[PDB]
From a paper:
The centromere binding factor 3 ([name]) complex binds the third centromere DNA element in organisms with point centromeres, such as S. cerevisiae. It is an essential complex for assembly of the kinetochore in these organisms, as it facilitates genetic centromere specification and allows association of all other kinetochore components. [name] comprises two homodimers, of [name] and [name], and a [name]-[name] heterodimer. [name] provides sequence specificity through binuclear zinc-cluster (Zn2Cys6) domains homologous to those found in GAL4-like fungal transcription factors (Lechner, 1994, MacPherson et al., 2006).
Full-length [name] rendered CBF3CC relatively unstable, but the complex with an N-terminally truncated [name], in which the Zn2Cys6 domains were missing, yielded a 220 kDa complex (CBF3CCΔN) that was purified to homogeneity and was suitable for cryo-EM studies. After refinement, the final map was calculated from 187,606 particles, with a resolution of 3.7 Å judged using the Fourier shell correlation (FSC) gold standard method. The 2.5 Å crystal structure of the [name]ΔN homodimer was fit in the map as a rigid body, and this structure is essentially unchanged after refinement with a final Cα RSMD of 1.1 Å. The most striking secondary structural feature of this model is an eight-stranded parallel β sheet. This is part of a larger solenoid structure, corresponding to the predicted leucine-rich repeat (LRR) fold of [name], and comprises eight LRR motifs, rather than seven LRRs identified previously (Leber et al., 2018). This subdomain contacts and stabilizes a typically disordered acidic loop of [name] such that the [name]-[name] heterodimer forms a toroidal structure in which both the N-terminal F box and the C-terminal α-β LRR-insertion domain of [name] associate with either end of [name]. The [name]-[name] heterodimer forms the left side of the horseshoe and makes extensive contacts with the base, formed by the “proximal” monomer of the [name] homodimer. This arrangement positions the truncated Zn2Cys6 domains of ([name]ΔN)2 at opposite ends of the channel created by the horseshoe. [name] and [name] line the channel with basic residues that are strongly conserved between Saccharomycetaceae.
Author numbering:
A (entry chain A): 54 to 320, 330 to 565, 588 to 608
B (entry chain B): 54 to 317, 339 to 565, 588 to 608
C (entry chain C): 4 to 38, 75 to 189
D (entry chain D): 4 to 30, 88 to 156, 164 to 202, 257 to 482
The structure:
Amino acid sequence: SKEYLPDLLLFWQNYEYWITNIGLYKTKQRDLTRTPANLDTDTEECMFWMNYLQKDQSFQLMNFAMENLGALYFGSIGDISELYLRVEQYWDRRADKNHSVDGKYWDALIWSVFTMCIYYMPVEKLAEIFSVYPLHEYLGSNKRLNWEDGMQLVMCQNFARCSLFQLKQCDFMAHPDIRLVQAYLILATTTFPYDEPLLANSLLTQCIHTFKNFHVDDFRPLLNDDPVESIAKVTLGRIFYRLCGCDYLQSGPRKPIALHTEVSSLLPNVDVYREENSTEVLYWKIISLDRDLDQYLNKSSKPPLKTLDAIRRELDIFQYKVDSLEEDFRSNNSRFQKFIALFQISTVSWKLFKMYLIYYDTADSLLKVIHYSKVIISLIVNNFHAKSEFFNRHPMVMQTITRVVSFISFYQIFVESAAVKQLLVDLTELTANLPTIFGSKLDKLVYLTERLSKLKLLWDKVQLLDSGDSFYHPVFKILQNDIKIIELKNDEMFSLIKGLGSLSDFRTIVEEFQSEYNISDILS
Amino acid sequence: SKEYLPDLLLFWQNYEYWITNIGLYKTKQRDLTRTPANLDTDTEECMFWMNYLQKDQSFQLMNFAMENLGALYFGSIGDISELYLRVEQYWDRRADKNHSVDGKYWDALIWSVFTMCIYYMPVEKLAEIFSVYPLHEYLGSNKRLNWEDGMQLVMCQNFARCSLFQLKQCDFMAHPDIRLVQAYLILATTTFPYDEPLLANSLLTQCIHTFKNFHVDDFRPLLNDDPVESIAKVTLGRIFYRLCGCDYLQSGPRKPIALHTEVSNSTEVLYWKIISLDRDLDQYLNKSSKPPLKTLDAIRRELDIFQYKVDSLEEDFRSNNSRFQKFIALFQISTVSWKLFKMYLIYYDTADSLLKVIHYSKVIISLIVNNFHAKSEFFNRHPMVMQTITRVVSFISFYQIFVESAAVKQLLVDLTELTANLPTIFGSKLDKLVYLTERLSKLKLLWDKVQLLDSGDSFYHPVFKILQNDIKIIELKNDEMFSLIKGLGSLSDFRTIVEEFQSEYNISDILS
Amino acid sequence: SNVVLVSGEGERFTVDKKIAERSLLLKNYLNDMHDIVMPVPNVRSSVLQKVIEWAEHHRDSNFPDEDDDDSRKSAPVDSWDREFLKVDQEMLYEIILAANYLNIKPLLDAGCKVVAEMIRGRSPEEIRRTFNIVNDFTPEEEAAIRRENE
Amino acid sequence: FNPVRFLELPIDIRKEVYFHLDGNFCGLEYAFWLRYDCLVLDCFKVNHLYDGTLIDALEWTYLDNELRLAYFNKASMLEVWYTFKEYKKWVIDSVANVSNIQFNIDNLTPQLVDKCLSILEQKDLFATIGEVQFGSISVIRTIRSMESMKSLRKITVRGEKLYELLINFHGFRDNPGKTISYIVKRRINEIRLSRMNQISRTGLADFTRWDNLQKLVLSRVAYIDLNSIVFPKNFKSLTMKRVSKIKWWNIEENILKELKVDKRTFKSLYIKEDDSKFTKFFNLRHTRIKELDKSEINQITYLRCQAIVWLSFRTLNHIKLQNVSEVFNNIIVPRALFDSKRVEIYRCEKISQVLVIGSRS
């Protein structure tokens, strides 16, 4: 019999929630009796990584971001030609021995902008601007590494830490101001929310508290307002919808305080149909389609087909709006905006037809999954060319492939097909050719896929037993115990007790495979 | 006509929400272009102010807390003889070079306990323990200042700041743990929520994040549980109910992330039930609506039930912890009773209301004057008597402005005499309370010397326009739109009397 | 500038890009980056040739909308479409499967209207009196209905 | 015709087959065998499987001295009829809890409406019934029973005799038994109107009493006036079927009273520049939409124009229009409901002027 498949596809939703989503990005094994305390206070380290930079290097980073990366910061900070004055003021106020809170806020904002500049610059321009040598003079690592060898990410993470250190010098908890939130919306474009998810959740809770301090709900200005007040409300609305997007991209069992009062498209105090659609709320609408799909992962109920068909209709509507974006390609900012919107709309299409395949098994759903996987392959391989390799550095290409190359692996364990194997070969070709800036995270993904490849072999050599009621095989036990182990590793009761307390060949094959390929290797 | 009295008593709800609560205690005038961003991050300050404390002095602080302060820390840390081991570990580990995060959490907890010891200690033992002279050698102030001048408040603020500095060395943002909530609830016993208000709001939002990290929503022990887990869930329930209490004691416009999901071992449950009754009373300050009579009658019936429960409580004379608990519980239930009959007087104008207000006001005065003797003077240092006496003297002065009575006048003289006799550990809040009482008395003189007029539809008097402009100025001062604009870019004889009163008796003097 | 579709059997067909924009998939598979061949699996080449002929017919026809639920009910039974889909049933279902895969709403609507006219005018008391996929019907219940038939 | 390959055919294509096959299951009728088809049970299994977005016209009737579910055609001819245990058994077959069942008053007799409500109340449930179809003894009999009607979400009211008594706020009378009981008005999520001529005559069309409206349907009405109608808090949708000449909002008269500019000079102020980017997808071909020029206005004045547009347009998501054949006062809609596919006009060749305000950036 081949009727074990629908319950196993329904088990994929639980496995995708706990292994691929939570346990790979959003779980950090902490142990408070072993972490070193912050007695350095990041003072010597960020003192070095602040006086390492020079002035001409900073203005070249600003010119690079001015002519390339505008689709990321243009909703957050606005127009960056205003910020050249702030860079001049930083390089003039660097010699001052008494700083103000406002000046240090502007300095933290421009250091976050520099962190994004370091994250999205290709290795050739970064080697022509910066020098490899004094970092190896300082960091004490191996003196043979280059920028393409894994030292660009170290400089990016240390610039993010220096932005956070300049936030620490403000007493940012005692002075709530908007330059926290904007700075986080520049730091939420790197892999900073995936490096330290605990610190990202704490800063994001501070950003939610800082935003809700202003008590602004409607960003449509009124008729009895200062012109400055109306421009302030427009910029605050753009910051708000970018903050909602960067807020949904970190959800899970460690993020309890939601900002999600934004009502999704036609199932809620902020109904998102009333704003004039700029880039930021368009990105939020695509993230809202994503969040309306991926709430049924850990839930036991099944999604209605009414909802999935509404998602299909609105998916085609925003698909056509991306075509009718209509900007000038000579400035190439619209090129990167078009890539972001097109990759997100292909991701949401893929998740829609994955849920079509799993929950209801509709007309050629697997074939549409293969088709949109090939579309994602096309949209990533097309940017293997020159001058636009860094387009493959926006963090959503790390998420979506992690959703794809797991699932097409998992289905390959149980249903043998011809197109699926060639698609898995294409994904295995694509996974190694992703940029090396995702580092260890990228490495972990390959390990997961490799484990699933080995999980095909144990499916083949072992015969499926039968009890009449339910089915029994070691693959089922191992896939169950993976979710059991990672749900055990997200239980903070033992942290509470460390706080204020005083403290059959079936089983053999399962213990052999879990002793050989442990799932806890993917935990951060 | 004489119709201004009910609408003016309804105006008192608005004035009591903004001026006596948000303006005096919960508003900090900030300026970001002039405030020194401390690049040192208080390392030079707290390094000295932690080298000032000595070991045997700290153990005498812990002994005083064990003897006399149990009804405060029992909600947060339970028993303090269990904490002596952690104090020993800190004093042995202090001489090291490296440190661990869990140790620094225990250090933040015991420094918060030290702050609670300093804030409630009487002045004679505090003078016998600590010197006065290195304080003025560091601060550069007068050598002739004493503890009653205000140096004990300065030492309390510096210990709170050094506890926060130990929290900042933990990177408590990137490492949530339950000792943050306990070390904040010990710092919530003082007037640290009134020195730095939005810093306390940020710490309380961090504590709400740290609590909801655990995902425990029901605190009852099951059968298949580890008993350690059941003890942990009971203790976490205690911390949750007291955290709801200290959350309600910091509400307002500058704190929108609230924990109040609960609606309406025996002591903490009694304490939260009294505070929740207080919450259901004072939820009608900022609102434009009015409570029904059935609501106030149910509050009165439950008030009599908890009055009998406090009458069912005991007291011990050799154990001062029991008298401290008894005074706190009886003062809380008397404050809730006074606020209930104040709402009776304001909203419905029911007979036998003002006599009940004077009755429970004299009960509050008797509970304070009973502690004016020896051996129990520090009972008046709890923040609830500052809040309660602020509301009482404000409402009695506002009632004396517009309604004359001899018993009310003698009550006002008693409140005014007791107001200057409050201890000097409240300091600037006490001075601004005296200034607000003096401003309302001069407003009474202005009400006396100026005729009330009427154009045929509504009344007109300078007192009404001044009391309205106070609320309008403080609602203008509690807006962050100007800070948002500065963040985005760098972009008749009647009127004469009103402007002279506003130019002489300014409203911005009660702010911070 | 011509666009090549690929069938399931392997025969590569060639249409124009403006012709291929009748499909709501070529319009979103070719619009990746402007700085040519679309595979269509599991479609026999005769079926894709008929779909291509239908797309070549209505090059300048105003179809109602995508979300007009009442214009689909007030049905225009087009003359060339009613002449076109007059084939046997399996060819018709393969055309409808291809139109669902190619995301072409009007051909899907026309095919479903033809199948709706077929299923509407079934033989009264001849095929309607024979239920044939009998499940969640006991022999007791079927015997009760056949006893209640007289 | 083979009904055994048609059932192995997948779900949504078979749905699209039944989408054009709503009421006419046959084509006078041999109603004995027509119920027990596999195709009819397939229709109702798919119809229960989505939400009820197909035919959904399931009535309670008292036929053959029995309370049973019944489906009526578009011309109100009876197609199928189920005993409730049967429909429960095959809904359980589909799902491997019913709550959406319509209730006419117009397609019934009051002497059996009373018995239907009495035995339906006292028998087991008096629940699982969503819509209530009004449009006078039977009406008052139904009103007394709606207090126990736990899960209803819809009210349809027919022509103007019954509307002004029940729905509009104008009365405020002293008859509690005649009108609603204010617990049924809390869960009243949709309201449809039909078979009338004027909604706002003899008073004012004010919906302020009815809280919690997320949709509204105006069908087959002669003359309405949007300027007269006010709307509740938390109002979402607005759908209008085939109507005659109607008046729209006073938005253009408020822009004309803002800039202090004339009518003919405003007709040279409305640009028609950005009409070839995305509005060609709208397939209008009759209404050429027009916007305001960016060079002929300031920034803050344009934001104030948007603020004037959102006044008397406060909370609305989508406006759906069938053939209206005339609109008097100068359609000028915001782009935030026009740039997405929310403002949807479908069959209007007689309408010509659509103005749209907002940035298309």
